[PDB]
């Protein structure tokens, strides 16, 4: 009934890619499904070099949400990532996600969001993904047509990130200095920084830029450097038809609504996919989705 192994391969690629693609490509294949016609079958996957279809039944009132799909983890700690000599495992299934709230930047409710800024990290050496977590104040809330709001010391909290991100690379090998800046896609040049947000069903898109202006160095100065008085909101324009970040493509969905909705959200789980591959590379990113939602409570998702 539940047969599975722990054996995930890593390489290069991106377009035909790997599990990562199959995960989302089909995760939304799932999210089209809640109800509609008068019939029977569709699939389930990830496991043993064969694939499952999950056939459903009914005729032609409360329901949970996912017609078939589920999730489950191991145990024994907070979280690390990999090289795990595993043991115990658990139950779980229901998935109502769309109904609630999300982002592509900062995972929501904190859960013992401790002063000690946490750089929780699933290693894969050079090419990998992280998760920072600080107590400090940050608050994120969106309004109507598509413009979002904030509170908290994001400059300093960012410095914390910056102050939290220096002490792990211990003297790599030489006498140095470090310049930090940001990019996302692979194989083509855009120039823009897009976060998403979910609360109340609508998959609302954001042209977040002023927020993401930051250039970063080891030991700096700003007296004779430049000063202007800029401030912030979010020029979000909802894209139900989903123009895509990591590749200029498209998606869509089927949500209810509450007319005069004003999206609100709790903060903390600031993320990145740092690219420090040999040479002059220390590349922050920002593409971490649905899989992280539960990868947020557990430590690491396992669906199937
Ligand atoms: C969904 O959940 C959300 C959870 O976050 C919730 O939103 C949050 O609610 C709270 C309470 O309403 C918010 O507080 C408010 O937020 C404003 C945020 O704007 C700040 O941050 C931005 C980013 O940096 C920036 O754009 C702005 O510059 C700004 O800093 C606040 O402005 C505001 O705080 C108070 O402002 C008034 C007006 O002066 C004061 O009465 C009050 O005390 C706060 O600020 C003062 O107080 C401190 C110390 O208390 C002072 O040092 C400071 O100078 C200032 O005035 C002073 O008053 C004190 C006396 O008390 C004293 O020191 C001096 O005499 C001085 O004059 C505001 O209340 C929270 O920020 C917000 N989150 C977001 C997002 O903004 C949300 O509502 C919820 N949805 C629902 C269901 O409603
Ligand atoms: C990845 O890519 C980056 C960017 O290309 C690269 O960074 C470059 O590093 C080199 C290291 O050689 C830098 O060269 C140095 O530049 C400084 C001054 O520039 C900096 O400071 C000013 C002011 O703050 C800034 O405006 C500017 O942006 C820079 O940050 C020079 O002063 C250095 O010269 C000293 O060292 C030389 C040896 O290379 C000596 O020959 C020279 O004499 C200087 O020191 C001497 O002075 C003493 C007297 O004061 C004397 O007594 C001693 O004898 C002593 O020798 C230095 O040439 C270069 O600027 C960086 N690039 C850019 C574009 O700015 C990274 O290195 C790279 N990373 C990897 C891993 O490849
Ligand atoms: C991380 O960010 C840093 C800053 O990022 C800014 O730039 C963009 C990338 C945007 O994102 C923007 O929003 C950011 O604010 C990067 O540091 C610098 O990045 C910039 C831009 O990429 C580089 O700037 C260069 O400037 C060149 C100017 O060339 C002139 O050449 C003339 C002929 O030689 C020369 O005369 C002239 O003037 C000189 O002379 C006077 C008088 O003697 C002297 O005082 C001057 O200093 C001059 O030497 C000019 O020098 C331009 O031609 C280039 O095309 C280029 O754009 C710059 O290389 C880089 N500097 C540093 C600090 O290395 C950082 O690279 C980013 N890092 C990463 C990894 O992305
Ligand atoms: C899988 O395992 C994780 C930890 O690894 C495990 O290591 C081996 C040895 C295993 O055999 C396990 O025993 C051990 O769990 C789990 O993470 C931890 O899980 C527990 C329970 O799931 C969490 O405790 C819960 O949260 C509250 C925190 O308090 C804790 O600390 C104090 C002091 O030690 C104790 O008083 C508590 O017992 C906790 O240990 C706590 O308030 C909760 O108690 C409430 O709930 C009960 C039951 O409903 C209720 O009756 C009572 O009145 C309380 O209101 C609760 O026990 C622990 O905090 C958590 N740690 C982390 C990592 O956050 C993981 O949960 C587990 N299963 C999963 C979900 O995969
Ligand atoms: C992951 O983080 C948790 C969260 O705890 C944090 O809570 C906040 C409030 C801060 O205080 C922060 O510092 C703290 O880490 C860690 O959970 C605690 O860890 C301590 C020690 O690491 C635990 O105390 C243990 O109690 C057992 C009883 O069975 C005792 O035997 C332990 O001694 C050994 O610990 C070794 C590793 O620490 C282990 O290899 C040995 O086998 C041996 O068991 C130890 O004294 C305590 O239970 C936890 N308390 C709380 C508040 O959760 C956790 O350690 C972090 N994970 C790792 C891998 O470090
Ligand atoms: C993370 O961010 C990085 C930058 O923000 C990204 O790396 C950059 O990727 C682009 C696209 O491939 C490269 O751009 C090319 O650069 C070369 C270099 O020519 C220069 O050097 C020679 C010799 O020194 C000199 O003669 C020239 O004058 C130039 O100064 C150009 O030839 C190309 O036209 C093209 O612009 C960058 O090289 C590269 N930066 C680095 C590391 O050098 C990175 O892709 C981002 N990663 C992710 C995952 O998003
Ligand atoms: C960042 O969050 C903290 C949390 O406090 C908030 O808690 C929630 C539940 C809500 O009710 C909201 O109103 C609270 O502000 C805030 O920082 C702390 O705020 C309290 C007062 O609200 C401070 O206590 C006071 O401290 C001063 C100086 O010591 C004294 O004058 C008072 O007597 C009283 O003790 C406390 O110091 C603040 N410090 C901490 C621990 O963070 C803060 O409002 C919030 N920042 C924002 C707006 O983003
Ligand atoms: C990022 O990873 C690369 C290489 O990735 C390696 O990962 C392991 C898990 C295997 O998959 C292996 O096949 C693969 O090559 C790193 O390259 C390694 O860098 C090491 C540190 O510089 C380096 O070790 C030292 O020893 C050699 C002599 O053996 C010496 O010349 C070096 O100066 C160095 O001190 C090693 O040479 C090199 N690869 C190997 C195994 O030969 C890369 O450094 C990692 N970089 C970052 C920035 O994370
Ligand atoms: C929460 O606790 C931190 C403790 O930070 C210390 O431990 C690690 C997180 C590590 O990064 C280490 O460098 C750091 O010292 C408090 O930061 C404190 O700031 C004061 C400034 O006077 C100093 O005493 C210390 O540098 C530092 N730690 C200690 C010992 O407290 C932080 O301010 C505190 N804040 C809250 C809200 O709980
Ligand atoms: C690379 O730069 C570092 C910068 O610290 C040099 O380290 C210094 O080494 C000298 C001797 O070469 C020592 O006296 C100092 O203690 C070090 N720096 C200081 C001032 O604390 C290192 O020497 C350089 N590498 C070389 C020249 O190969
Ligand atoms: C991968 O999983 C298979 C079972 O599907 C297992 O036999 C094998 O040991 C794993 N390969 C490794 C070691 O990565
Ligand atoms: C595949 O999953 C479906 C869920 O509907 C189940 O009916 C079927 O038994 C599964 N097939 C196998 C043997 O994996």
From TrEMBL:
Keywords: Apoptosis, Cleavage on pair of basic residues, Coiled coil, Disulfide bond, Fusion of virus membrane with host membrane, Glycoprotein, Host cell membrane, Host endosome, Host membrane, Host-virus interaction, Membrane, Transmembrane, Transmembrane helix, Viral attachment to host cell, Viral envelope protein, Viral penetration into host cytoplasm, Virion, Virus entry into host cell
GO biological process: membrane fusion involved in viral entry into host cell; symbiont entry into host cell; virion attachment to host cell
GO CC terms: host cell endosome membrane; host cell plasma membrane; viral envelope; virion membrane
Disulfide bonds: 38-60, 45-51, 64-94, 74-86, 142-148, 199-263, 206-236
Residues the record marks as carrying a glycan: 7, 52
Primary residence: host cell
Cellular compartments annotated: Host cell membrane; Host endosome membrane; Virion membrane
GO molecular function: structural molecule activity
Domain comment quoted from the record: The 17 amino acids long immunosuppressive region is present in many retroviral envelope proteins. Synthetic peptides derived from this relatively conserved sequence inhibit immune function in vitro and in vivo.
Complex formation: The mature envelope protein (Env) consists of a homotrimer of non-covalently associated gp120-gp41 heterodimers. The resulting complex protrudes from the virus surface as a spike.
Protein name as catalogued: Envelope glycoprotein gp160
Native organism: Simian immunodeficiency virus
Residues of the full protein shown: 66 to 499 of 878
């Amino acid at each position: 009934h539940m047969e599975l192994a722990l054996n995930v391969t890593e390489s290069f690629d991106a377009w035909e890619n790997t599990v990562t693609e199959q995960a989302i490509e089909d995760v939304w294949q799932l999210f089209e499904t809640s109800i509609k016609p008068c019939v029977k079958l569709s699939p389930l996957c990830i496991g043993a070099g064969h694939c499952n279809t999950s056939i459903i039944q009914e005729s032609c009132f409360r329901y949970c949400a996912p017609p078939g799909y589920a999730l489950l983890r191991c145990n024994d700690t907070n979280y690390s990532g990999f090289m795990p000599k595993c043991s115990k495992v658990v139950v779980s299934s229901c998935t109502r996600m769309m109904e609630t709230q999300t982002s592509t930047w900062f995972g929501f409710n904190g859960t013992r969001a401790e002063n000690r800024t946490y750089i929780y990290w699933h290693g894969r050496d050079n090419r990998t993904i992280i998760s920072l977590n600080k107590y400090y104040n940050l608050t994120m809330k969106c309004r109507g047509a598509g413009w979002c709001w904030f509170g908290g010391n994001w400059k300093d909290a960012i410095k914390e990130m910056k102050q939290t991100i220096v002490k792990h690379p211990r003297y790599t090998g030489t006498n140095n200095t470090d310049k930090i800046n940001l990019t996302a896609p692979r194989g083509g040049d855009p120039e823009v920084t897009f976060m998403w947000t979910n609360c109340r069903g609508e998959f609302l898109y954001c042209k977040m830029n002023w927020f993401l202006n930051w250039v970063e160095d080891r030991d700096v100065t700003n007296q004779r450097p430049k000063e202007r008085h800029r401030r912030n909101y979010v020029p979000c324009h909802i894209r139900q038809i989903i123009n895509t970040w990591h590749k200029v493509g498209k998606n869509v969905y089927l949500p209810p609504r509450e007319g005069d909705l004003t999206c609100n959200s709790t903060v903390t789980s600031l993320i990145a996919n740092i690219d420090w591959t040999d040479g002059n590379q220390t590349n922050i990113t920002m593409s971490a989705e649905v899989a992280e939602l539960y990868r947020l409570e557990l430590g690491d998702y396992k669906l199937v």
